[PDB]
């Protein structure tokens, strides 16, 4: 029902061309991005690829998922995503190589393992996750996006060779990349970190294994990282009872979600 009529999308500047298709910097009710397919002759696979792909994205509505806005095919076939105000994660660690802080460098690794847990709850196979499409709105939250080939070592052996447990072999390579900042090629022994954790050395090692059957399920990767958050120290000095914010307002401010008198 998210068909919007033809002649609505003020399209813009081309962002990259390649195997995925093409991307413009559109503008419909604020700036959006559009995953456009430049072709006009509809190949019979994309008669079938498009109708299932929007069947994926029609259900995912969550913070860490890049919010699906719209789609159209009547002048040309494309989909309308959201427009994150920031670079990718491939951008942060390889292109411009921005150094980060350890109390937050794993707090994006909570929030990429947080958001993909919403995918498997809706039983959705990502099948193509790398660092190159991990987006960072305002450098605070982390959005997951551009999961086109996503059907609602088996890849490098061709033994469908995909399940829930088939991306977590790659999901270790995401969190490995945060630690050392250099892509491999068994990336384990290079793991000299600044705070130098042990459970992160464990949980990196307990995902990238060869025996494909014994890979850990996902809601014990959310829960075994939120445990690791509380033992990495937030402050570097003691604190006191601060200068109190006596202003007359002290309640919890519920009035977004209800009325007020």
């Amino acid at each position: 029902d998210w068909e919007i009529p033809d002649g609505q999308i003020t399209v813009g500047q081309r962002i990259g061309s390649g195997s995925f298709g093409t991307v413009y910097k559109g503008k419909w009710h604020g700036d959006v991005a559009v995953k456009m397919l430049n072709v006009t002759a509809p190949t019979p696979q994309q008669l079938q690829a498009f109708k299932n792909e929007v069947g994926v994205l029609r259900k995912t509505r969550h913070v860490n998922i890049l919010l699906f806005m719209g789609y159209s095919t009547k002048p040309q076939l494309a989909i309308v995503t959201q427009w994150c105000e920031g670079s990718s994660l491939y951008h942060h660690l390889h292109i411009i190589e921005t150094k980060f802080e350890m109390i937050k460098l794993i707090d994006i690794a909570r929030q990429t393992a947080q958001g993909m847990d919403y995918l498997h709850a809706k039983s959705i196979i990502h099948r193509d996750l790398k660092s190159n499409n991990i987006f960072l709105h305002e450098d605070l939250t982390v959005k997951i996006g551009d999961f086109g080939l996503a059907t609602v070592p088996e890849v490098i052996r061709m033994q469908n060779p995909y399940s829930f447990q088939s991306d977590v072999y790659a999901f270790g390579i995401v969190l490995y990349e945060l630690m050392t900042g250099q892509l491999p090629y068994s990336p384990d022994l290079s793991k000299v970190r600044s705070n130098c954790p042990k459970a992160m050395k464990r949980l990196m090692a307990e995902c990238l294994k060869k025996k494909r059957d014994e890979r850990p399920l996902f809601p014990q990767i959310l829960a075994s990282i939120e445990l690791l958050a509380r033992s990495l120290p937030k402050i570097h000095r003691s604190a006191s009872e601060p200068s109190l914010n006596r202003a007359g307002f002290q309640t919890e401010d519920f009035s977004l979600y209800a009325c007020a008198s």
Partner: protein, 230 residues
Amino acid sequence: DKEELVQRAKLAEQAERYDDMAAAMKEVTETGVELSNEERNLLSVAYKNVVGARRSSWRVISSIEQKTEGSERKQQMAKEYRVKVEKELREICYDVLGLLDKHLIPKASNPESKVFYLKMKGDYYRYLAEVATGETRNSVVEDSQKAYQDAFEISKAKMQPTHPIRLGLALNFSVFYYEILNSPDKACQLAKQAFDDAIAELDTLNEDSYKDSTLIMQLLRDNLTLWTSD
């Protein structure tokens, strides 16, 4: 006279000149008022800022004197300046301390309010106890806890186990034992006995306003990790 005298420092509150803010608040206190919660809060933001401006300069001056091992002239150049802040810092607190004990603590009647100055009473003693040296150090450290324990006992007869003065006393209580007395074994005992006393509460209701109290509660769990990392 009286109400306009409050207005003088309240005007200076957003004016960000805290020295005249502090001097206006002590001047109304000469009359016997049992001052309300629109006035007694103003001294804590004042006197923590008059002290903290000096104290945040103490922490870098005592740093930078140890940051060099060179000539004794430039070394003694630091120590002559490190006492100018130190001689300044003590004279601020007795203005507070000599105010509150002479009339205001005996006028601190109600135990929803009498606990509040007793928090602030020994707290400035700790501020002196960070810097005071020799046998002067031991005579206020034993006076800190003596000025702390007779408030924490009123927290047993206090109203609510989630009340933010009862939280902030415990947050000030536990931060003493690690920093000054250097007793890390009794450090995490006070926070655990105060956090888990509170998290087992707040189950039926928080109809009283409590967003001020939850940021204190995050502070308790925050600094506990470095206290337990050793």
